[PDB]
Tab-separated table of C-alpha atoms in Angstrom:
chain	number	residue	atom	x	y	z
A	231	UNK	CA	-2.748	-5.976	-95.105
A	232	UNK	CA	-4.215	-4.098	-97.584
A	233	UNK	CA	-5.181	-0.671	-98.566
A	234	UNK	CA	-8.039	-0.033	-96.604
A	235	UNK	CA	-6.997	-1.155	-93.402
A	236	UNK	CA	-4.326	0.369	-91.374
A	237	UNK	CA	-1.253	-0.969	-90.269
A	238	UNK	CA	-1.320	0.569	-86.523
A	239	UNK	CA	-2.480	3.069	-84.152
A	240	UNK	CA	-1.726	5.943	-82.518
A	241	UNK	CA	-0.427	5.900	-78.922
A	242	UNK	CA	1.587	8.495	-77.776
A	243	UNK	CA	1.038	7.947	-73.736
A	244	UNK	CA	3.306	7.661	-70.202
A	245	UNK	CA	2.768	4.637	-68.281
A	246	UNK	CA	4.575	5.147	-64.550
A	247	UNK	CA	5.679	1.640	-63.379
A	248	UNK	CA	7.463	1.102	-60.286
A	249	UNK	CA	10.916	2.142	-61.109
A	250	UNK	CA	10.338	2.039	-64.853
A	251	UNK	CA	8.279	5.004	-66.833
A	252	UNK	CA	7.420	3.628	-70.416
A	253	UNK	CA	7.203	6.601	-73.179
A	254	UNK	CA	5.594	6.341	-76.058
A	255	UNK	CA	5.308	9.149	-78.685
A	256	UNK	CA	3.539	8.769	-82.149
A	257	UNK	CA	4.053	11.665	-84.943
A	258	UNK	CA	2.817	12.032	-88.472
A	259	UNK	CA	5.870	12.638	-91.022
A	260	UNK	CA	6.488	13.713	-94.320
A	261	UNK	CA	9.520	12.182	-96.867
A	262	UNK	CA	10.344	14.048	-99.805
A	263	UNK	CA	12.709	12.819	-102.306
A	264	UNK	CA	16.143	14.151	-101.554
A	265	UNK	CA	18.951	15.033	-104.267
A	266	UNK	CA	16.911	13.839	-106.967
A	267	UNK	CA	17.527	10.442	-106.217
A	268	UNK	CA	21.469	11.342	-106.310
A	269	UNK	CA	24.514	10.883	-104.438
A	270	UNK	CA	25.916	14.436	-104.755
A	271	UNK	CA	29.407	15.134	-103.527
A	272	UNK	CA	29.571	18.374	-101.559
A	273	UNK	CA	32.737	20.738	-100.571
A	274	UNK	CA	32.915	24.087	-98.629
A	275	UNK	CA	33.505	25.304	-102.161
A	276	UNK	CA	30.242	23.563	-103.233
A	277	UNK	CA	28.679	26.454	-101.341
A	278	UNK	CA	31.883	28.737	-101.909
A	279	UNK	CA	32.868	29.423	-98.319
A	280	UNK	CA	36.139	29.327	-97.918
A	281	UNK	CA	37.928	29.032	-94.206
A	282	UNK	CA	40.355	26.733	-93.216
A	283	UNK	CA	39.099	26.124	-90.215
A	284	UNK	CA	35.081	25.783	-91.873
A	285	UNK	CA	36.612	23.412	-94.998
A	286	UNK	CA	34.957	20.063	-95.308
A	287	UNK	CA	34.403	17.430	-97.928
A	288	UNK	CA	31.667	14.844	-98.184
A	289	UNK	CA	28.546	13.574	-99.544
A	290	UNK	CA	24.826	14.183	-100.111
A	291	UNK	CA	22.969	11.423	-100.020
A	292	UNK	CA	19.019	10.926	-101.183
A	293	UNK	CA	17.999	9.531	-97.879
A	294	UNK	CA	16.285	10.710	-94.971
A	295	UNK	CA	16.606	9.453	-91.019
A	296	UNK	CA	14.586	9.554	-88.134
A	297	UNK	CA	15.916	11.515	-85.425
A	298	UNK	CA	14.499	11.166	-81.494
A	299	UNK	CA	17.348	12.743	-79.910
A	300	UNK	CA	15.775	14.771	-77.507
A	301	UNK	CA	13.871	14.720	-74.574
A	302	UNK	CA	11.085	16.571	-75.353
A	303	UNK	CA	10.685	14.009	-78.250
A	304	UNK	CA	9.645	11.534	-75.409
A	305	UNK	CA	8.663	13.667	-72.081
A	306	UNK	CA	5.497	16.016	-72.198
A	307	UNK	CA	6.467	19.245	-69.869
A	308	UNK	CA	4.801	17.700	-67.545
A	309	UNK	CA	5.832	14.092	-67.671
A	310	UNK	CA	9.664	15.889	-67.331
A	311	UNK	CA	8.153	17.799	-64.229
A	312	UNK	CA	6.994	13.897	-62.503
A	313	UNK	CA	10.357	12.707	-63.103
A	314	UNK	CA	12.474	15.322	-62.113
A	315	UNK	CA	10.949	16.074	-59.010
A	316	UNK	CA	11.193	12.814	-57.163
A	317	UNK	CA	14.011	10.826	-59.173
A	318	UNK	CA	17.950	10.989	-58.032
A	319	UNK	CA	18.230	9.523	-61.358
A	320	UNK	CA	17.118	7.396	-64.830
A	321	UNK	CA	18.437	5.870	-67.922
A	322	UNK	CA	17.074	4.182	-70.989
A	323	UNK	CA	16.338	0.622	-71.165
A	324	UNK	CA	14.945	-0.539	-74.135
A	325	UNK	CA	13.800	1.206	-77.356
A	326	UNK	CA	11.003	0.211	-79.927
A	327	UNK	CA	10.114	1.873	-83.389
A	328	UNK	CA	7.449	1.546	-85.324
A	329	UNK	CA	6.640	2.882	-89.051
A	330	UNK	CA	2.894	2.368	-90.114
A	331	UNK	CA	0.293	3.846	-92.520
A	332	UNK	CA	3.177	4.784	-95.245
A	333	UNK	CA	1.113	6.631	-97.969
A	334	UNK	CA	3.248	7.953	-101.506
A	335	UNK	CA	1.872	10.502	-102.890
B	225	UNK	CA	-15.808	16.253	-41.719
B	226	UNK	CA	-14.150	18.319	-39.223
B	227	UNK	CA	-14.572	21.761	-39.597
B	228	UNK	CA	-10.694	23.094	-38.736
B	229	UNK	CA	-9.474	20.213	-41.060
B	230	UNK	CA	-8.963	16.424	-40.693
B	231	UNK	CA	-10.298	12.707	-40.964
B	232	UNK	CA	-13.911	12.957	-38.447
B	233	UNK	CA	-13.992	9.361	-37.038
B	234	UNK	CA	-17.056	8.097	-35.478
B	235	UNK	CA	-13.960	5.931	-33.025
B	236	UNK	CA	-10.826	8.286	-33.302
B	237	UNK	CA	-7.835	6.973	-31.669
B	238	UNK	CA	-8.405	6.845	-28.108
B	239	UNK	CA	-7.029	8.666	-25.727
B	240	UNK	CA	-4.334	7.652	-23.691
B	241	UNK	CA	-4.507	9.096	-20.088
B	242	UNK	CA	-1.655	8.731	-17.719
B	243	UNK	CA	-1.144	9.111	-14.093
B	244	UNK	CA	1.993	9.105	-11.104
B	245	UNK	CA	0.580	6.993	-8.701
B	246	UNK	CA	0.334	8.840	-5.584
B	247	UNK	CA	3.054	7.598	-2.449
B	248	UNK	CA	1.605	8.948	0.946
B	249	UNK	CA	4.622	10.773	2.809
B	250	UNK	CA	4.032	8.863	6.335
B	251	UNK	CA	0.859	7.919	8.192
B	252	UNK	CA	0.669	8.972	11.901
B	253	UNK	CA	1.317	6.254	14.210
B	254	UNK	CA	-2.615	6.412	15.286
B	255	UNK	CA	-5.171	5.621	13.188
B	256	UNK	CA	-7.290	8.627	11.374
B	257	UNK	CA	-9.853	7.973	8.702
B	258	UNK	CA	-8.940	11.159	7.067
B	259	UNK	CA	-7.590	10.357	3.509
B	260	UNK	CA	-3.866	11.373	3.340
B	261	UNK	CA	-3.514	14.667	2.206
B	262	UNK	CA	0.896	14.293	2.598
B	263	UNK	CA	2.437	12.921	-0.375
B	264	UNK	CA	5.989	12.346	-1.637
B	265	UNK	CA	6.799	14.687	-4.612
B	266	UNK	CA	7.567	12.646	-7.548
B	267	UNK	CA	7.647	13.163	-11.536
B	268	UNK	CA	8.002	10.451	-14.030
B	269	UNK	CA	9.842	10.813	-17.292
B	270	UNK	CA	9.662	8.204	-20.080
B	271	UNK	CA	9.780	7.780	-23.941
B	272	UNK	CA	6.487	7.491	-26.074
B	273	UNK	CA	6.701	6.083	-29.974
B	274	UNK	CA	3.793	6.618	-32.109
B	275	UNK	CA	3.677	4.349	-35.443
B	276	UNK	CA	1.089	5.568	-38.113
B	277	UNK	CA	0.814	3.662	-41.367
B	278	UNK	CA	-0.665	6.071	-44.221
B	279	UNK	CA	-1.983	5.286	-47.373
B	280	UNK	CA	-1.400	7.389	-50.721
B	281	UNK	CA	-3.539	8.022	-53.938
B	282	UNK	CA	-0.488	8.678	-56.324
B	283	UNK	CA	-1.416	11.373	-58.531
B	284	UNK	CA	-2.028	10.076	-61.929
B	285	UNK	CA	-2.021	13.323	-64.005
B	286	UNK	CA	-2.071	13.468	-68.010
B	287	UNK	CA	-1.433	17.287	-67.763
B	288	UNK	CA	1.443	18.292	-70.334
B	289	UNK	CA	2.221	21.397	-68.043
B	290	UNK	CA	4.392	21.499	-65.137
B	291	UNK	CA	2.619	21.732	-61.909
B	292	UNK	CA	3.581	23.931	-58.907
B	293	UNK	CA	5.227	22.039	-56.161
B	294	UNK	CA	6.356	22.759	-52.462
B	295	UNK	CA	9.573	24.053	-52.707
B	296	UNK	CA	12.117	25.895	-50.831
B	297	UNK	CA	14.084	28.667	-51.989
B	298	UNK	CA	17.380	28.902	-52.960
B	299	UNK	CA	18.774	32.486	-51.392
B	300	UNK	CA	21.081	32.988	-48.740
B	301	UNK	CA	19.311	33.583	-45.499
B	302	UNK	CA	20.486	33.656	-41.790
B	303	UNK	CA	19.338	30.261	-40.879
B	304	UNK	CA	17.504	27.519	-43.172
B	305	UNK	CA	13.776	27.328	-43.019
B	306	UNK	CA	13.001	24.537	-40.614
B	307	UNK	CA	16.245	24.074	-38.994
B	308	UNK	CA	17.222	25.121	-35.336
B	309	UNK	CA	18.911	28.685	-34.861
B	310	UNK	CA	21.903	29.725	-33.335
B	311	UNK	CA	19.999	29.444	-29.776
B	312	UNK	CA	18.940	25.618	-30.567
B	313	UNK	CA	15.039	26.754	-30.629
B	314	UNK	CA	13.118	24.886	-33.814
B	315	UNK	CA	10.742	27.038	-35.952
B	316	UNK	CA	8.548	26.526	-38.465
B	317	UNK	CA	9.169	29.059	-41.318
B	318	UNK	CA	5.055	29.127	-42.757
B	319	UNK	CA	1.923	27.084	-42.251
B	320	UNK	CA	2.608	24.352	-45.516
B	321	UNK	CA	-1.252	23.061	-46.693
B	322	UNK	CA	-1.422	19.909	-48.559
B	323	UNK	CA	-3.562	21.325	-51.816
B	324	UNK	CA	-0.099	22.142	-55.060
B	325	UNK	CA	-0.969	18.858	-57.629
B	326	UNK	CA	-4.245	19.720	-59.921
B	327	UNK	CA	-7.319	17.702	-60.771
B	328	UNK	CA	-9.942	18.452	-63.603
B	329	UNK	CA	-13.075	19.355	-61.876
């Protein structure tokens, strides 16, 4: 622990088992402060457009979340291209998440 | 290595030579040293099985891209590359080579 050392490493490889390929995928983010630290409540007349069909209510909150709902998020082009060429098929196993060298600024 | 293409072996497989052993038709009924030119007519017919057991070097690419592959196409055609026509004669469509994954030099 510390400031001077880190708390991981980078490692964004594909490691082809047997019948398992293991993705990994490290990215650098950036976290501004959302709202103003607020829990805003928004309307489709909190941006004025008005459509029955477009009406919502709801709230703003001051957080942000990590998103890896894609594929290219995990497969390079050609990673994609080794699995979709000989594969009748796949599915996730097992998911791990890291969050390391957190810097505020 | 052999010029046209291939594995050159100091001890390739050996060859396999195979004969119908001859049957004399009938001897005359006193003696001649000549050597038995009449023969019974005779063909033999049989199944052969060859067995080969081939070992791979998986390709073990880090390339993002994807690579070109072997493919076939899909547009209607008369009959389907490497298939039997209408007569029952096999053909093979174009010469396929073994060189479409990618190495750094």
């Amino acid at each position: 622990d510390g400031v001077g050392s880190s708390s991981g490493n980078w490692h964004c490889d594909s490691q082809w088992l047997g019948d398992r390929v293991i993705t990994t995928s490290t990215r650098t983010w950036a976290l501004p402060t959302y709202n103003n630290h607020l829990y805003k409540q928004i309307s489709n007349s909190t941006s004025g457009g008005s459509s029955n069909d477009n009406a919502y209510f709801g709230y703003s909150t001051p957080w942000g979340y990590f998103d890896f709902n894609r594929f290219h998020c995990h497969f390079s082009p050609r990673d994609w291209q080794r699995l979709i060429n000989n594969n009748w098929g796949f599915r996730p196993k097992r998911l791990n998440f890291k969050l390391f060298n957190i810097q505020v600024k | 290595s052999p010029l046209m293409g291939g594995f050159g072996m100091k001890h390739p497989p050996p060859q396999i030579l195979i004969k119908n052993t001859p049957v004399p038709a009938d001897p005359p009924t006193a003696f001649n040293k000549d050597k038995l030119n009449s023969f019974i007519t005779q063909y033999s017919t049989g199944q052969v099985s060859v067995e080969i057991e081939w070992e791979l070097q998986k390709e073990n690419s880090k390339r993002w891209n994807p690579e070109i592959q072997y493919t076939s196409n899909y547009y209607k055609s008369n009959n389907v590359e490497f298939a039997v026509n209408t007569e029952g004669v096999y053909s093979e469509p174009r010469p396929i080579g073994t060189r479409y994954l990618t190495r750094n030099l």
